[PDB]
Amino acid sequence: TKPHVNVGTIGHVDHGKTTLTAAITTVLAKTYGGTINTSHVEYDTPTRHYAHVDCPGHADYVKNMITGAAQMDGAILVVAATDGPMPQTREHILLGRQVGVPYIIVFLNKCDMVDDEELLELVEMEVRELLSQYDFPGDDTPIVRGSALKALEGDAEWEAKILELAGFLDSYIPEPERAIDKPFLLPIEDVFSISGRGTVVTGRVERGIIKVGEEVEIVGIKETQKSTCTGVEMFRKLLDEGRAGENVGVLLRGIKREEIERGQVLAKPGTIKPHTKFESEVYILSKDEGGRHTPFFKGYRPQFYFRTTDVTGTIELPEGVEMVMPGDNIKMVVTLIHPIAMDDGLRFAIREGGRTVGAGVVAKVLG
Amino acid sequence: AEITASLVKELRERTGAGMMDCKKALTEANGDIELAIENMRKSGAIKAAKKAGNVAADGVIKTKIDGNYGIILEVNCQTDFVAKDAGFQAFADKVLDAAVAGKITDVEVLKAQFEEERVALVAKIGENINIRRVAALEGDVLGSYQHGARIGVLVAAKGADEELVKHIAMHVAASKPEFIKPEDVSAEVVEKEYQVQLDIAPKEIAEKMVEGRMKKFTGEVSLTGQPFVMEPSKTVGQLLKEHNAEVTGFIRFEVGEGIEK
Ligand SMILES: CO[C@@H]1[C@H](O)[C@@H](OC)[C@H](O[C@@H](C)[C@@H](O)/C=C/C=C/C=C/C(=O)[C@@H](C)[C@@H](O)[C@H](C)[C@@H]2C/C=C/C=C/C=C/[C@H](O)C(=O)/C(C)=C/C=C/C(C)=C/[C@@H](O)/C(C)=C/CC(=O)O2)O[C@@H]1C
Ligand SMILES: Nc1nc2c(ncn2[C@@H]2O[C@H](COP(=O)(O)OP(=O)(O)NP(=O)(O)O)[C@@H](O)[C@H]2O)c(=O)[nH]1
Numbered sequence: 001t002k003p004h005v006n007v008g009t010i011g012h013v014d015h016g017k018t019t020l021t022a023a024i025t026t027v028l029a030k031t032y033g034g035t036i037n038t039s040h041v042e043y044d045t046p047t048r049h050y051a052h053v054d055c056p057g058h059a060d061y062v063k064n065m066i067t068g069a070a071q072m073d074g075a076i077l078v079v080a081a082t083d084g085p086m087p088q089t090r091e092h093i094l095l096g097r098q099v100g101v102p103y104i105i106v107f108l109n110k111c112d113m114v115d116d117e118e119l120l121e122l123v124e125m126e127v128r129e130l131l132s133q134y135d136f137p138g139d140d141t142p143i144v145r146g147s148a149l150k151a152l153e154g155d156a157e158w159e160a161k162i163l164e165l166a167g168f169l170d171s172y173i174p175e176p177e178r179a180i181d182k183p184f185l186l187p188i189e190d191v192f193s194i195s196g197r198g199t200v201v202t203g204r205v206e207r208g209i210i211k212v213g214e215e216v217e218i219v220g221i222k223e224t225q226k227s228t229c230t231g232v233e234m235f236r237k238l239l240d241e242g243r244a245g246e247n248v249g250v251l252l253r254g255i256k257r258e259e260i261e262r263g264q265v266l267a268k269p270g271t272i273k274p275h276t277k278f279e280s281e282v283y284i285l286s287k288d289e290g291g292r293h294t295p296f297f298k299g300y301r302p303q304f305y306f307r308t309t310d311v312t313g314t315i316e317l318p319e320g321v322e323m324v325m326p327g328d329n330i331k332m333v334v335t336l337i338h339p340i341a342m343d344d345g346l347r348f349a350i351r352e353g354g355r356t357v358g359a360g361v362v363a364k365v366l367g
Numbered sequence: 368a369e370i371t372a373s374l375v376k377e378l379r380e381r382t383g384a385g386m387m388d389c390k391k392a393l394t395e396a397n398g399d400i401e402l403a404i405e406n407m408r409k410s411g412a413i414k415a416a417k418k419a420g421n422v423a424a425d426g427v428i429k430t431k432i433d434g435n436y437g438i439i440l441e442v443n444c445q446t447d448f449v450a451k452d453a454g455f456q457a458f459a460d461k462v463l464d465a466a467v468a469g470k471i472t473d474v475e476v477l478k479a480q481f482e483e484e485r486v487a488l489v490a491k492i493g494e495n496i497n498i499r500r501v502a503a504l505e506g507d508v509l510g511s512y513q514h515g516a517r518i519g520v521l522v523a524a525k526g527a528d529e530e531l532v533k534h535i536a537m538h539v540a541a542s543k544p545e546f547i548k549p550e551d552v553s554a555e556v557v558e559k560e561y562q563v564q565l566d567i568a569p570k571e572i573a574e575k576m577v578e579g580r581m582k583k584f585t586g587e588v589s590l591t592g593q594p595f596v597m598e599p600s601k602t603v604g605q606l607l608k609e610h611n612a613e614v615t616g617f618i619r620f621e622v623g624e625g626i627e628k
């Protein structure tokens with residue numbers, strides 16, 4: 001069978017994410033040979049098969065980046081050995097923590113323009129400090145040097161740095177088989193209306209086991225609706241039951257396109273519940289993190305993002321604080337206008353007109 | 368006196384970007400940081416962002432108001448836990464309480480006075496503790512604001528009530544000022560900044576709008592020229608016309624910075 005794991009590049013803009021991806025395949029293909037629908041790439045180390053997806057490192061193109069970050073069980077941080085860590089480098093990492101991403105491997109790209117050794121130690125220290133701050137095992141995170149461009153054509157030396165990297169893919173990243181054994185849960189990515197079949201919603205199974213023929217519990221944005229699972233199909237082929245970690249579709253006999261919408265949660269009848277007012281910790285992004293530039297107060301009306309949907313909520317900070325600055329991280333209460341399914345231990349994010357505001361976890365639900 | 372590791376390190380710490388780019392621009396300045404910073408801004412590749420001497424240490428900032436005399440200080444500890452063990456956090460108050468009552472602007476006096484309890488606390492907590500600096504501010508109506516433990520701020524005025532003096536302190540802690548009005552800006556600062564804006568290159572028709580960018584900069588480094596934080600739709604030099612007042616002085620303390628008179 002040979003187990004396979006979804007991975008992908010990640011990091012600051014044009015540090016060399018795509019060119020590394022080209023390098024990894026080209027090298028692994030000329031070396032050996034013998035669950036993702038987005039524009040991806042595939043290569044095989046003698047240990048595992050790998051489903052790799054490149055993401056753009058621009059601050060604006062964090063759209064399919066987060067989508068990709070969710071699916072990958074391991075991220076390949078691309079940091080320029082020259083420029084070093086940049087806002088998006090740490091932007092991606094923190095977002096990585098919020099959106100799963102079990103493990104992380106760093107690739108010091110563009111290492112062919114660094115003669116000064118002391119400069120290599122500085123960026124490695126700075127990088128390793130970043131993910132150590134954003135709740136990632138930085139102090140013992142594999143950081144591989146070398147170049148992607150020089151590894152692309154010829155150079156058995158720079159090609160070895162790629163094989164080295166891919167070696168850590170098998171070494172550092174373990175088998176992410178652990179997922180189910182808990183109540184079912186799934187976010188909605190899109191709502192389609194087929195004239196022959198009916199109405200099939202999409203989305204990756206976050207956790208739990210879904211079998212064709214069971215009930216559901218549509219929770220989110222509007223009312224707590226309930227239907228029945230008519231069938232589950234992947235890509236184009238059918239499916240008997242269903243396994244978590246994969247991304248499929250579920251039809252609902254009686255529910256059409258106008259009845260259900262993107263961002264809701266399908267779960268086991270009596271597990272998760274919708275809320276508008278919640279308790280949270282909330283970190284706040286700074287300038288070096290590509291976040292807020294000016295401080296805000298108790299009159300803030302931004303755009304909150306939960307799972308696949310986004311809600312507009314207010315603020316309510318504890319009696320003792322009156323201002324939040326780009327870099328703060330104080331626990332507080334937010335009241336949303338739309339009820340969204342949540343529980344104790346949900347990582348979300350806040351955004352407002354390009355500038356990605358901070359992100360925190362949900363302490364306890366309320367109303 | 369050439370290129371060291373800690374040299375290019377700090378330059379980036381006050382730049383925000385370009386690791387290897389720093390050393391390249393630094394070696395062009397033959398080792399001088401401020402010359403490099405000028406050249407980097409005049410290169411049209413730096414969004415200013417000059418943070419003067421970022422020490423990036425860890426400690427506490429405490430303040431205490433007392434009618435006309437207000438004393439603020441900085442006490443550097445070790446880990447973030449040391450700053451919140453309530454023993455050292457109260458120790459700093461002990462230093463503050465005797466500093467305010469003694470009205471000390473000479474930090475060396477506080478050193479010897481509390482060197483006894485310092486070593487006694489250091490040996491008890493196992494953490495190296497030090498009192499960095501302390502300054503004072505005289506004014507009619509004082510007001511302080513403790514934005515956490517890292518940042519504190521003292522603001523004195525004449526005419527603003529008990530609430531108005533606090534809201535101004537929050538702005539000082541937020542939008543880091545450096546002067547009151549655009550008028551009281553040192554010509555040494557203006558001229559050296561003038562060479563930066565002027566070196567950005569229309570002939571003799573873009574020079575006049577560049578000197579106009581100075582007028583936006585003078586409001587940016589000031590406080591009356593700076594826009595409010597609670598409502599940036601208006602400045603501040605038009606906000607002292609509320610209860611008819613005027614700011615006397617400003618003091619901003621952050622764990623780090625310094626090395627400047
Ligand atoms: C055949 O026709 C049709 C179609 O073509 C077929 O599709 C190929 C289709 O095939 C089906 C049968 C079936 O095989 C196809 C199934 C398809 C499944 C698709 C699944 C996915 O996209 C998933 C990865 C995503 O949603 C995934 C959950 C999503 C992906 C979500 C990405 C969100 C991006 C938002 C970014 C903001 O600008 C932002 O600036 C910002 C900072 C936001 C904050 C984000 C955070 C912090 C969220 C967390 O709260 C969290 C943990 C989020 C995780 C999350 O929600 O991941 O059938 C149709 C009928
Ligand atoms: N010398 C050298 N140049 C490199 C290396 N990796 C990338 N580059 C250069 O970096 C530029 C952008 O490369 P690219 O791979 O597109 O970066 P990216 O991370 O994919 N960009 P994005 O994520 O926005 O799509 C190109 O000019 C490329 O030559 C490297 O290892 N060495």
Ligand SMILES: [Mg+2]
Pocket residue numbers: 017018054055056057
């Ligand atoms: Mg790319």
